[model samples]
Target: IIGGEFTTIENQPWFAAIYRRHRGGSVTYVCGGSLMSPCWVISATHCFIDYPKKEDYIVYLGRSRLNSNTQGEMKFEVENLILHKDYSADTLAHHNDIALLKIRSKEGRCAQPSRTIQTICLPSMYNDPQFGTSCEITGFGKEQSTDYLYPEQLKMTVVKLISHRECQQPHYYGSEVTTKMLCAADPQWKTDSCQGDSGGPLVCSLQGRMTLTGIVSWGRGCALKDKPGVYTRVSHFLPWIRSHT
Candidate 1:
């Protein structure tokens, strides 16, 4: 997602790719995603559930803004959905909240060399004792309460990792937070995910590579003074994810 004042690629080359909007409609209801493989993408389960069988949910890889108009036209169709079997909206627990997508085959038509899609590395272990580590968040979510998802660009923010002890406070996630899940971000507020940012990545740069530490799950509010954003810890679901992939 585009983060700074420079909206155009002339000044912000890193924020100029178009995201593959799930439904081939306008980009308003879209969310950011990362390529996990040539045939798969990692995104929030909610984005595609409403229209589970629509082929219009095109995934445009390697573009930063949707206004590309004529560049990087590598659009791929979604073939199947693999939501975590235990996902529950009412309670929001399952710890296994991540989902997978299987893209249709179109050999050589959508492949690119410079902007080839790829997956981020998964955390090696759950509850990696090195808790409180720093991570990065990116999305096309609202810039302010009044603004909806960014119209022409994506946005990004950094959040520090947190522990379960501090995350379970009633003021935070209440009793819904669990150790089996991954928890990060400071409850200090004003620097977490907001509307339209769900299902984005909570990434950590390790040994020169970015790893998927968590998936943006839910939160009380964006940047609430003492409320932190919750994420589906990726490390905890590696086994299940490997089996599904």
Candidate 2:
């Protein structure tokens, strides 16, 4: 279920939009995707790979809401998809679980100079090994599982960073903790990313604009005690990401 204000596209027009295939026909799943370049979009690899086929996905920019019924409005089509070479579904390791996609601009045209997709700059380096560092997480996942999906609005939540050692406590994630992944959340209370929130950005605002620190990867359950949501550390995969981009 999605939470937050549900305003029309005309009011809050800068939010990026994503659509994925679901059972029966396609149902829209919204995610906070930022333009990495004029032609590229950086999103969670899990978002596209879980689909039956990549071609079924479509991405829309320049609008906060879907205007499918409104003629002449624009939305982009995904032209190509590239998931990290090491991504594996079974183990849920998600070593390099980032994915990049080339999107088709309106009317088979290329992204215009004025309306190009914007890419968020990656963190120059990993944060120091310290728990309690603050970060922000945004998604379109349910505010509460019992609530309806927030297909039209984006929700933002703040979480505290957790150290690997503390995260590995028997009451917490146990031995599954790895240096390759970044863990952050409120451990005392139940607050975290959940189903349908995969691929959204986990940002750290250091000096100014938020930087991509992690990507929503997986969790045992949303906001469950002793179980914090896991994310793909953007810094760990920086080399590979730069290579492809």
Candidate 3:
């Protein structure tokens, strides 16, 4: 919230805004998502759990500056929603927090590849990397606590993949981190994702291309000391993504 820097979409073209509209009035970007394909998007189930109407959700692409409709910017209406069956709002377990949203234009079209709109590669089963790896997490979330501003532009910060055990240590997430969840932390810096960053991508540079490895899930708070942000491990859900999308 306090640390991410403003950036363009050149390096993260797959990053998109999951905006919500209450039946054609104004709009509010409730969360962020990763473009898995022109027709399919990956986000957090919590994004739509409260407002589950597919007609109210829209996927906006090719815009780094949220309100400024750039030339190539396009919007799509959600056609289908598929949330992980294990996701539960009442339980302490924030397991399986992923969801897939399919979208289509009025013209029955899908997202077009452009300088600011492209698909992010989902991680393969055997391609899992280890702890201590570094990656970036970006979003157009709240910039500060009391600014009354829900980000006007996208910002990004680098974080590291830490050991699951380290995340469950006496000073860490303890017994809360599960197998389906992964942790990202800046051990020395403590930078992390905040309120509006959920459902966004935790992407790492894999072999040359940026690969989506996780989805922003939950955490104690943003950039806290000894507390790391948790995410849904995408590698653990490759089969689910494949069968559904």
Using all chains and alpha carbons, the TM-scores for the candidates as numbered come to 0.80, 0.79, 0.94
- Candidate 1 per-residue lDDT, tens place, 161-235, comes to 877887787766767878766666643555667767777778877766678777777766567666677787777
Please list the C-alpha lDDT of all candidates, in the order they appear: 0.61, 0.65, 0.84
RMSD of 2: 3.8
Give the per-residue lDDT digits (tens) of candidate 3, residues 1-245: 44868987776789888888876599887899999988999999988887777888878887778788866888899999898887776333476788999989999988889887899898888676689999999898766644567777779999989888888897887787877788888877546888888999999888887799889888775787887888888998999999998
Candidate 2, residues 1-245: lDDT per residue as tens digits?
A: 22334443333223346786666985676454656666777777767665636577767655544434332235677877788877765443455667877778646664443332345667767553356777766555777766655544545666788888988888877777678777887745556777766776777776675677777787766777777778888787778878887
Residue 137 displacement (Å), model 1: 0.9
Candidate 3 — which pairs collide?
none
Candidate 2 lDDT score at position 138: 59
Q: Model 2, residue 3: what's the lDDT?
A: 32
Ten contiguous residues with the weakest lDDT in model 3: 86-95
Rank by TM-score, highest first: 3, 1, 2
